[PDB]
């Protein structure tokens, strides 16, 4: 044999070793060809949906989602006892490669071992190809190890005007890159070292941004309490007062909450929503080169005010979906909606205004006038939390290679990397297909929980009530399932 079967996790000090071994089956895509693809074939009825690009015969491996590397238990173990984590090393092995050739005479096909076939598999470490991993697409290794999966088909999109290309478009030939070729006695391994990244914050702040103050003392600062003495003409006056625990709205604070871009508000009780088709017109959306595009998920913002759980920001959520969910027009309870509310202390709510500002200058003939600030970007002195990472969410994304950026952490959450884990492309050699094994390993560094807090934490736990099936487990028919999206913010720190 060309490799062994390793799946497990080792817990050593601050380190976690995540070992997954999966079994893949790769067919031949595009009948061994490259193909133009565009909107007009599929019908291209939108200027926002207009695209041009090429689908290539190759497949690729994608482990970029968490449920690959962490069993639901080891996720629970990690979340409850840690204040942060991040990847250190990467180790990937390809082995036990097989190539089956297909012969179908009339009704029934016969599949037999072809021993001399080769498999072409290379890794692009210079990021010369288009890199599609940071887009949260399907095709990643199945959460549950016994399941066998179909390796995705690679493809890419280059620049376009409508469906038509432009002279600055590009065409990348995956045959142009030197690629080791593997037979049933060959095995391909490489390793990778993660670049410096900040520990993911996996805690909920105990205190909010505006309650940082001491409740027992006054401030020495003063504020303007009264602009008139009473009812009548000529009451203009200036009165002042100490900012104190009596009125805490006004106390001078060092820090202020982060950015906001307002999302429309949708209720999960369908009769509180307006009787109109506001799904597309209503939603926030950013425009690029004349193409409109939705704002999704957007800046990291609390999902709803405290105490209001039937509301979710229209486009501003990560909405996963339950096992078995249909592709199109599925009912609202077929999907799972994540909520970021744990950040609501530091970050504004997505469906509310960040604040107000004063429009005019008051006089005897003018009232002080204010207006709603809908979208407020970074100002010096802001603090915020990023979006959480979930068992079902992405791990990393590639930071676009550009003049500059601010807070490179990706807006769907996870660890942004300029040199993320490289893409691994594979194909059959030019009716035949391959099957083989994959063992990927990551080494994670942990941040241990330091708290002196007296009273016990919120922990993640499996609820205690009899049910037909154990959660995070197979049903009777064999289909694995993930009942709900498990974020990591449970323990607590001071602000």
């Amino acid at each position: 044999s060309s490799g062994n079967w390793h799946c497990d996790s080792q817990w050593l000090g601050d380190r976690v070793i995540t070992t997954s071994t999966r079994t893949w089956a790769l067919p031949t895509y595009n009948n061994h060809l490259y193909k133009q693809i565009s909107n007009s074939t599929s019908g291209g009825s939108s200027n926002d949906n207009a695209y041009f690009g090429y689908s290539t015969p190759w497949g690729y491996f994608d482990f970029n989602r968490f449920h690959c590397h962490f069993s639901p238990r080891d996720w629970q173990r990690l979340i409850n006892n840690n204040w942060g984590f991040r990847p250190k090393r990467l180790n990937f092995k390809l082995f036990n490669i097989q190539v089956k050739e297909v012969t179908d005479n009339n009704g029934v096909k016969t599949i037999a071992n072809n021993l001399t076939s080769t498999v072409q598999v290379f890794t692009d470490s210079d990021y010369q190809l288009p890199y599609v991993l940071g887009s949260a697409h399907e095709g990643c290794l199945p959460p549950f190890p016994a399941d066998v999966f179909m390796i995705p088909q690679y493809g890419y999109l280059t620049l376009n005007d409508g469906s038509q290309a432009v002279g600055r478009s590009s065409f990348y030939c995956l045959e142009y890159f030197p690629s080791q070729m593997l037979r049933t006695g060959n095995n391909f391994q490489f390793s990778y070292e993660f670049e410096n990244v900040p520990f993911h914050s996996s805690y909920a702040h105990s205190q909010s941004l505006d309650r940082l103050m001491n409740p027992l003392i006054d401030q020495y600062l003063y504020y303007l309490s009264k602009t008139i003495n009473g009812s009548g003409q000529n009451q203009q006056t200036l009165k002042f007062s100490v900012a104190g625990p009596s009125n805490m709205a006004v106390q001078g604070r060092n820090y202020i909450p982060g950015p906001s871009y307002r999302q429309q508000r949708v209720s999960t009780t369908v009769t509180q929503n307006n009787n109109s088709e506001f799904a597309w017109p209503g939603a926030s959306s950013w425009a690029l080169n004349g193409r409109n595009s939705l704002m999704n998920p957007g800046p990291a913002m609390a999902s709803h005010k405290e105490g209001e759980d039937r509301f979710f920001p229209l486009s501003g959520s990560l909405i996963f979906g339950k096992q078995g969910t249909g592709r199109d027009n599925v009912d609202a309870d077929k999907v799972m909606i994540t909520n970021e509310e744990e950040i609501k202390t530091t970050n504004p709510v997505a469906t509310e205004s960040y604040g107000q500002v004063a429009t005019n200058h008051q006089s005897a003939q003018a009232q002080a006038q204010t207006g709603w600030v809908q979208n407020q970007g970074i100002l010096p002195g802001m603090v915020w939390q990023d979006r959480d990472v979930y068992l079902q969410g992405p791990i990393w994304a590639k930071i676009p290679h550009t003049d500059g950026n601010f807070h490179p952490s990706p807006l769907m959450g996870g660890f942004g990397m300029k040199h993320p884990p490289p893409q691994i492309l594979i194909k059959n050699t030019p009716t035949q297909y391959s099957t083989g094994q994959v063992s990927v390993e990551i080494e994670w560094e942990l941040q241990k929980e330091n708290s002196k807090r007296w009273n016990p934490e919120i922990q993640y736990t499996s609820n205690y009530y009899k049910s037909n099936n154990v959660e995070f487990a197979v049903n009777t028919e064999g289909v694995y399932s993930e009942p709900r999206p498990i974020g990591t913010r449970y323990l607590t720190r001071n602000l």
């Epitope: 009780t269 369908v270 009769t271 999902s303 709803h304 405290e306 105490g307 209001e308 759980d309 039937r310 979710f312 009912d331 309870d333 909606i337 994540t338 909520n339 509310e341 744990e342 919120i458 609820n463 009530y465 049910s467 037909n468 709900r484 974020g487």
Partner: antibody, heavy 126, light 108 residues
Framework: EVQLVESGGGLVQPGGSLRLSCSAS????????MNWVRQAPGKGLEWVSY????????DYADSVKGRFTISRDNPANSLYLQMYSLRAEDTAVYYC???????????????????WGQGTTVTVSS | ALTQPASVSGSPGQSITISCTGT?????????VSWYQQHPGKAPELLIF???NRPSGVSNRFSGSKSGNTASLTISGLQAEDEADYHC??????????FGGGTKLTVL
């Protein structure tokens, strides 16, 4: 040790008014919803109204709708149902009940009513 | 509302099943149902929440099922304690709950 006990009221005249109050003891009252359901003497349960923990959502099944209000005081652990323009169509044992909760994070809902009040009889008769 | 029989009877030892039928907004579409036993002059006690889920206090013999556009309570191993009136509860499309006429169980 979870105890929902409501005082409420007895016999009252048609067209009159009544105020039912409930007392939650042994469990955290501010998290749960609360329901008012009624069982007419010979007939099955009917759900009059529910109130959210924060009080943001208060919805009435439409028989009453418009003639009752619902209120809850979280520091006082007490749910209130005040009713006006009573009819004979409203004579029932009124229950103070709460819906299932499991103490988790937001966007988690459970459908069923965990604990029930022992009831108060309301007789609206001319 | 939810339509369920007026009454059901069974002999001790044998499992029997009550059903409550509803519109696609009440049950057919949404998976919300729940079941309650009640004894005369006692506050109802929850048996089954969601469809098949059951609370810790409640006994084994009570299970639940949804065959679609319908929901059913299957009691096993009838005893004298099991005599009670069983109710069907399902939150609707508008998130306002509805019940059904109640069904008395008479153990012979």
């Amino acid at each position: 040790e979870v105890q929902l006990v409501e005082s409420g009221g007895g016999l009252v005249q048609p067209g009159g008014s009544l105020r039912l109050s409930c007392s939650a003891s042994g469990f955290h009252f501010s998290s749960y919803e609360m329901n008012w359901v009624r069982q007419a003497p010979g007939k099955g349960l009917e759900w009059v109204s529910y109130i959210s923990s924060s009080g943001t959502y208060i919805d009435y099944a439409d028989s009453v709708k418009g003639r009752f209000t619902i209120s809850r005081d979280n520091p006082a652990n007490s749910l209130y149902l005040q009713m006006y323009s009573l009819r004979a169509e409203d004579t029932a044992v009124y229950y103070c009940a709460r819906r299932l909760w499991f103490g988790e994070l937001p966007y988690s809902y459970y459908y069923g009513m965990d604990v029930w009040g022992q009831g108060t009889t309301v007789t609206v008769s001319s | 509302a939810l339509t369920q029989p007026a009454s059901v009877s069974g002999s001790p030892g044998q499992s029997i099943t009550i059903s409550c039928t509803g519109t696609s907004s009440d049950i057919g579409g949404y998976n919300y149902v729940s079941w309650y036993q009640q004894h005369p002059g006692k506050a109802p006690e929850l048996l089954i929440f969601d469809v098949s889920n059951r609370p810790s206090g409640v006994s084994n013999r009570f299970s639940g099922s949804k065959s679609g556009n319908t929901a059913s309570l299957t009691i096993s191993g009838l005893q004298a304690e099991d005599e009670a009136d069983y109710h069907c509860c399902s939150y609707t499309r508008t998130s306002t709950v509805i019940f059904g006429g109640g069904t008395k169980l008479t153990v012979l």
